[PDB]
Please model this.
Amino acid sequence: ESKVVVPAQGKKITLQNGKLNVPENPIIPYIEGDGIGVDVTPAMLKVVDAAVEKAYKGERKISWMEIYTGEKSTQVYGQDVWLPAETLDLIREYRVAIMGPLTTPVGGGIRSLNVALRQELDLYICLRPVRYYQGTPSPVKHPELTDMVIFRENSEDIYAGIEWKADSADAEKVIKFLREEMGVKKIRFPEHCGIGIKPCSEEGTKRLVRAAIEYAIANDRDSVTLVHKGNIMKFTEGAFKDWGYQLAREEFGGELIDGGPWLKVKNPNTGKEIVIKDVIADAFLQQILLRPAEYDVIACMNLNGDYISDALAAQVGGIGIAPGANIGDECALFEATHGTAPKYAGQDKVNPGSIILSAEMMLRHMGWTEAADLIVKGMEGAINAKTVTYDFERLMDGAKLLKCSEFGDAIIENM
Amino acid sequence: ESKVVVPAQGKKITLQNGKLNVPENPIIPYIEGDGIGVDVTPAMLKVVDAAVEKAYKGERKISWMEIYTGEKSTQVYGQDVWLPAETLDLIREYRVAIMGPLTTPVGGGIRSLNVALRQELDLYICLRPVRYYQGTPSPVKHPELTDMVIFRENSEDIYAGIEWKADSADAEKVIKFLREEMGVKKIRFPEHCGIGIKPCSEEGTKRLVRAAIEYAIANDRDSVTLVHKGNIMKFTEGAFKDWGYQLAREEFGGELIDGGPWLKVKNPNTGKEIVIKDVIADAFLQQILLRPAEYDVIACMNLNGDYISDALAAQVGGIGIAPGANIGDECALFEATHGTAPKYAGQDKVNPGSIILSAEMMLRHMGWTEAADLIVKGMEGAINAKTVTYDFERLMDGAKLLKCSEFGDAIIENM
Ligand SMILES: Nc1ncnc2c1ncn2[C@@H]1O[C@H](COP(=O)(O)O)[C@@H](O)[C@H]1OP(=O)(O)O
Ligand SMILES: Nc1ncnc2c1ncn2[C@@H]1O[C@H](COP(=O)(O)O)[C@@H](O)[C@H]1OP(=O)(O)O
Ligand SMILES: O=C(O)CCC(=O)C(=O)O
Ligand SMILES: O=C(O)CCC(=O)C(=O)O
Ligand SMILES: [Ca+2]
Ligand SMILES: [Ca+2]
Model:
């Protein structure tokens, strides 16, 4: 028995040959989110409606439709309903959706609801753009040199949750198989030993890298860097790097730069040379601090992407305003990237920036670039104005302290 | 037929009940290192001899004994000799050794010689202290707030090199076993798929965490933070966190702080309260930038430790001067932590700081704290004096440019 209400006014977005067809009255499912979701989601709804209204002078309007996942889903659908089947069906059916932060419970053997959503809908691209907003307090000297776009592989890697607990019958069984059937000698302590599996496939790697390159082409970016720990994990991380370079050669006319290993790919629209290169992951966490300007589009595996995105967000003072998308071939789910921060929930206190900027990515994904531009513009103005939420204000002098909802208004005020 | 020459003057260090017995004329094996090893090692030898000579007025002297691993080993012992058996025997026999950077060849199925050395000698602690040297050009505003000591688990994790290449008969076999015998459903693309294994054991985790806590006690440090990605990898990363906390409760009288989950451990020598806490790895890469002062001793798994150490080193401007040790129960191997940088090899140009500070850790490990203190003092003086190698100088105004060997002298000059 669904508790979802389809808006009476409103039409579903359609997908016609890899191309979204967005009506002027699209229905957008949204998940409020747990904890501070109660604060940031309404700020996002208001800010989005304003930008859309201003951009198209009332010709277009989103019909928001609440759907459920997480703690609130249990309150709505009952006890063990953390992720209702219909939520998966609805996101797929309506093609574009957005969500606040989710609470995954502990003690019940439930795995990350965020990851569940990504894997279940096969949203194989985790897209995390990272730029600096002038006026943001940052811990680094030159945050303005950071302008990157992370394509993080979302469907494979150790992140896929294949593992067995130490001393479990399964763990014992897997370890037996490995030592006796596979002749594995390098397990240091085979007893009381947990075991995880890290898969990385040619198809998985290539759909991710294909998207990263298409994005560099579509947006006239300077380069795509394959980031990997291939010198230690040759057949997963190293294979990802090799497949990445290969895809570039096979589908995009990638050709050797000097002695290699870097390649150049010609932008078929602008004729610009896009550099395809690679950096070992540990060095890369150094290079983003020391030479951020040399990096643009990044393509990498699941776990590394997680680390890199977070490291970048912190460096530009954007820990609380980092936008993110999960994109597959059939639908897309945009998200607040921070946690539920239950301590502040309901206080109208936290920064709605992250979910607002994810909504910006959503609008842009929908082809409503004018409205998306107004959000970027509003965000830039409000931050420049030093009219900000506590998390920014406490790090600045002469800022005006705004509530969550008030920061929403300040964004609108600057549109 | 050994090509190693045991020094005529000199005595071997001994181990008596977990306690090193160091004679006044200890023999120390050293591996020159490939590439810039030719530049930094002699700078290290000279700087160490000076500190030892000054500290003990000639009463003590190290008898350096060259041993081999890497490219130079092939030149010495022949074609496929990258890591001679005797090198393992010698390091174990002489208890304390140091090395420059190593070249692991590509194309021959040889795995990291660094990792080989660590695993083969069971040097299960990778010890990476990270502090700021006043005067070092850093990309962050307040590098002086960083004063941490990383205990990185060295013997397990995905870093152990257990994996099979996509399309290999073994890969196919492992994937078959997993899908059909283990009922694994979450491998997205089972074809053309590489597979790695990530082990984490109770014993492996606890010997690492035990060392981290003993170190916090011995050095009156404020806290030990377990860093892990346990919310996604429950049975490896999560188990490491749980075992860590458990070890603290079982062996060190760890007790709940407030509602937990943090614990307090009483320093049995100073009565100081040592906090045992934990942070998810992705957040931790943010927290080291945003709140570096809240962190002290870190305990974490192999791969995470790799990332964290490198990220920290970059933030304090120490990418080229980061010291490191590999420590086991029977011996210890100190190392330059940077690469071989072949482009500058032999130019007497690069920064010998990393290997010099690893030598500082070696001297301290040997109980020769007075000599170790003189190196710290020299390094602080030379850097403060702005008398530095190109890698520092190019980032500063009004520095004096020194060659590698000259920077060695500047350190001595400041002792
Ligand atoms: N949008 C936001 N605006 C301001 N602070 C945030 C935001 N999101 C997260 N935080 C901070 O990060 C944490 C994220 O919550 P959690 O990781 O427990 O789910 C919160 O405790 C809060 O930390 P703080 O106590 O420093 O203000
Ligand atoms: N001790 C050092 N002093 C100065 N620069 C170093 C040092 N170690 C490494 N580097 C730099 O880091 C790289 C490490 O070498 P590799 O990772 O290829 O093995 C070198 O190319 C050099 O980069 P750079 O060209 O910026 O001067
Ligand atoms: O999603 C989770 O629940 C943990 C991993 C994470 O933060 C992410 O994947 O972005
Ligand atoms: O050791 C290697 O060869 C690569 C990994 C690394 O740099 C390290 O483990 O410190
Ligand atoms: Ca994250
Ligand atoms: Ca490293």
